[PDB]
Design a protein around this ligand. Sequence first.
Ligand SMILES: [Zn+2]
Ligand SMILES: [Zn+2]
Ligand SMILES: [Zn+2]
Length: 130
Amino acid sequence: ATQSPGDSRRLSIQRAIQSLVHAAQCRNANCSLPSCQKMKRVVQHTKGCKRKTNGGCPICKQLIALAAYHAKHCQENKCPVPFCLNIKQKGGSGGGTGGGSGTIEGRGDGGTTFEHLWSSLEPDSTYFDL
Ligand SMILES: [Zn+2]
Ligand SMILES: [Zn+2]
Ligand SMILES: [Zn+2]
C-alpha cells in the first residue's frame, strides 16, 4: 500500500513537509523541483531570523507548523534541520495556552484542524504553495 486514497489534505501536507525537510539541506545542483527551490527562500530567511523572541515574522511561525510533522517522522534523533530539533526542544504543548479549546469548527475532528492557520497565509503566497 502506497499513494492509496484517504484525503487530499494529508497529501498536500505531505508534499509541503517532504519539500521543506529536503530544501532545508538540499545542496545538490542536480535537484530541480519547484517546491525545493521555493522552500530555499523560507529556509534561508528563517536560518537568519533571530528577532523571533522579540517579534518574529509570520513565516517564522508558519515554518514550525510543517516542521512539527517531520519532527514525528525523523528517525535520526540528531535532526540535520535546525527547526526540527527546535520543535522537539519546545514540546509544542503550551501547557497553559488554553488547551486548544473554545473553537467553533474543530472539536477534535478531521485530524488536520491546524490547517485553518493557512487561511491567514498571504493571499498571494509568493513563498508557499497556494
Ligand atoms: Zn533539492
Ligand atoms: Zn522571519
Ligand atoms: Zn528531524
